[PDB]
Symmetry: none
Subunit: 164 residues, 8 copies
């Protein structure tokens, strides 16, 4: 039987679907970067998409580990066009900060219900978000300093294209 | 500029989205199997899901390689329950046969427009489908030997759960 | 069930049987070369016999992979004597060319039925047939040059006796 | 010239062709096992078929080594269907026993003609036959113990499917 | 004897000479890049020239494999100048597309004559062209955004100058 | 700017083109040997063609090194047939000596203009020509002794066929 | 079922019991040497008893391989005293010769019944007996040269005591 | 001279003969299991038979070490059949417990005579008997859990056949 409340299971399941949309969003950003001829940015986004899927499966397993069941929901069509390089990364940061707040909402719900296990389990994602947001903020600061110069952008694209 | 016709690009892009759904459908089959207590069939479906993504990404890279662009579409909600294992795998088989025929449709279209590059590129998928379909027919035939015996179905669960 | 037509399965199965006779024929050629004291040429024919068997088995597995079944047919008695080294290889070439045309007939059949999986599958045999025919024409060219001089013929026998 | 009587040469040549039929019969049994979804048993049979061919070639070489010649004969169509796994293996055993007696008939003929060379050469086959019969009897015994339990039969299949 | 039709032999032989000119053109572009002091771009073109030679020799060998003969034709003087780096690459792309169409024309001819062996052999060149056109297109798009900036042009030179 | 006179530049560029024709002529000789079934002699000729290209590239680099530019010229159609092995190698020797005299001409021209750097650069080609001529004379001597005896020709062909 | 006649099985089973007695007999010789203070001789005899058991177990396994059954019979009390070292070894030799003849009798019976498998199987014991008798004769000859001299017997004892 | 009493020597010498019979009895149990198709249980008994012999030999050596002599007695015919598996092992246990008591009798006898060396020497055997009885009881316990399930009985057979 489930050892988590139906409320927490729902919250986790929806976060699972939320992570899947995140991954699909970043893939969409990759289709945009590839369209604009920036293989390095595209590459970074494909990796970011992959990392997001692992996050989703990490929620997947926990849900079953507590007797819960995962229900895959419809995934919405993501945007495919951005004004430019910086805008796409800006949207990536805004999206990360959104998933971080989504994580926060589950943590507060689990905390209110004294579901200490789930609260402990979420700690990892909190720390991971602080890391992802910082990555994007760095890229943005760099793009901001680049101020449109194709020379710096090309470097940035080459570097980000190195992400393992 | 695109060197593939708009008709072929569209056929390729829709197949790309179709692969993503196939992956999602298999993940959903996995949620069904995990909920029913069959980890083995679950593990297999997950692996089958990742394989379908690598397929989608091949369509992805080729579309760009031909000067086109990828556009990600909305992914409909997949079924989350089946009337038993056999019913599940049969839906899986039925689905693969459907993607195979989809693949066949692009190939005839490309062939008709004398787009030899796309016709040749599709060859790899035709061969994969032959392999994927055969693995499901195998499983279905093995389940058939179980003839309801659960102790046997559990043995097939432990085997499929060995997939690398 | 069978995802290949009865017509196609028959064409495959009959080709499989044809490949087995081919193997037996090359073995027979080996019995002739060994009786004439040419161990090297015999060795070559034995290697060629095994090759053809691997071809047979390739058709064998594909047939089952497409839900078909293989039925082994009676193998006719192959010739056991030839009018000299040249005559033997000439017969071998003639047979190889017959096998290729056979391969061709199955391909056009599958193509007419839009059985792309099978058309694709046959490509490998088409390329192998090109390689096999060429090996025999080279041998026949060298024999033509040898013009019956035991001196060079011994060399040919030695070289061919090196085939792995 | 031949240093074996024409009688012994004929008996050796007929045994060679008899080994080839054995090899073919075992392949036919493989067609049946594969048709029945038992890859493993089919594998064991494909290996058995190959082993039989090495035995035929061992008769082949001896014949030439005694100055004889080999003449390949037609190969009759073998049976392609059995009433279950146990029935196929029983027919295999029965076939083995038949080849064992075949080897005895030659041994006795050679011994009658005082062909000590050929008698000694046959010694190897007598010993091998004892081992080949034991193997099949061992398998039959495992099948009898399985007593229709698809569970253990699944294990047997996978086991025999490992034959090197 | 020739097993390919005279029409196909002629098409192949003409394509071999076409690949040779292609090699020579790319070398000519190297003469231009070196005259403009771009070692990296020149290097890339020298490597491309070699790649084309290997293609010509694959046609050479296939012609002999089908019993045909190669006849080398005169090679026309290629252009030795272009209006800047980008212009040279536009010319390269347009030339790569011409080669692809040339390959297409042979494929269709062979296909119409039912020369399956030749249609199959050409598949490799269809796939290689897709890859060659893509490299050039990628380079052109990068130069397009470079808009003549000497900074990025130097980055491109070095990068391309690494081609192995 | 150019530090070599236009006259010397012309002579070096024309020699570069001459080397390319040599390369092409040796390939042509290869098409003749392959057509006659002497793969070894064909191989040797293909290796000789490659060696001639490296020489062309030597001239190429020196021209740029002295501030000149290379201009690829049309390459004429070479003969494609000879009256036999001996005849072909003889035509090869005669061509090599033609190349040597050509090298002599540039050398005398550079020496008259006191272009010591070019005179010095040409020394390497004068010594290489000594080696090239000798290799063909050596082959011609063996063919002379062979006097048609296919027995030694085969050996000569396999030997030359081993050139690296 | 049994593939050996009841008469052969009987002969084999009885030989097994016979081998077991030999073992017991040699152990008894060990009890005599030990009592006489010759640990080395005792050691050799204990190893000999072990060898005899391994021989008995060879008959054991062969009997079941041919569908037979082993029935252990009573073991008679062996002598426990001898008139000296030499006497003990003469008795062992005489016993060995007895088993050799016993093997001979079974061999002859098997041969008469045309049971080639059993004849072949007994070959190993024929050769083994020749070697065993030889070891005992070798010891007897060393005891002869010894000529009652304790000095030499001490060495012989310590020596035979090294048998592994 | 004998430093052990004739009473203790006889009890030790009789125990040695008892251990040999125990060995033979367990071999007989193995003849029964093999006859019934259980190789595992037969394997087990074979190992048990060998273990008992080492016990015998330990008694053997100790007897000499105390200046006594060993006299091998006639060994009786052991039972060759049992009313099923359980019946055999139960007899085995009964026999184990019997040799245990026999050991106790010698121990109490030696103790009564103040033969401390013999009392100490027997300790090892008391401990080994505990180990052996426990093994047989565990086997019987598992046979009970098998509850006539031939399927399970074969599983145990395979387990005991792994004894080292
Ligand atoms: C590098 C390209 C990565 C593209 C990722 C695209 C993701 C699209 C979202 C759809 C969900 C797919 C389901 C996949 C589940 C995989 C589970 C693996 C478990 C080990
Ligand atoms: C060392 C030389 C080897 C010669 C091999 C000759 C084979 C001739 C084929 C005769 C046809 C008999 C059927 C054989 C079926 C073998 C199936 C193998 C399946 C793995
Ligand atoms: C390093 C720069 C490469 C320059 C290639 C220039 C090619 C010019 C075309 C002229 C024809 C030359 C003949 C080449 C024959 C090669 C044969 C290889 C056989 C394995
Ligand atoms: C270490 C010294 C060896 C002494 C051997 C004495 C043998 C006496 C014969 C009595 C028979 C006992 C039964 C032995 C069965 C052995 C089975 C082995 C199976 C691998």
């Amino acid at each position: 039987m489930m050892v988590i409340s139906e409320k927490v299971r729902k919250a986790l399941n929806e976060q699972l679907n939320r992570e899947i949309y995140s991954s699909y969003l970043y893939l969409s950003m990759a289709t945009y970067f590839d369209a604009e001829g920036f293989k390095g940015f595209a590459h970074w986004m494909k990796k970011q998409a992959q990392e997001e899927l692992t996050h989703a499966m990490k929620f997947y397993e926990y849900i079953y580990e507590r007797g819960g069941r995962v229900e895959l929901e419809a995934i919405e069509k993501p945007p495919s066009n951005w004004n430019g390089i910086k805008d796409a990364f800006e949207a990536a940061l805004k999206h990360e900060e959104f998933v971080t707040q989504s994580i926060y909402n589950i943590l507060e719900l689990a905390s209110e219900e004294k579901d200490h296990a789930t609260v402990s389990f979420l700690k990892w994602f909190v720390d991971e978000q602080v890391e992802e947001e910082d990555q994007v903020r760095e890229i943005l600061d760099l793009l901001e300093k680049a101020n449109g110069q194709m020379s710096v952008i090309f470097q940035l694209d080459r570097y980000l294209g190195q992400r393992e």
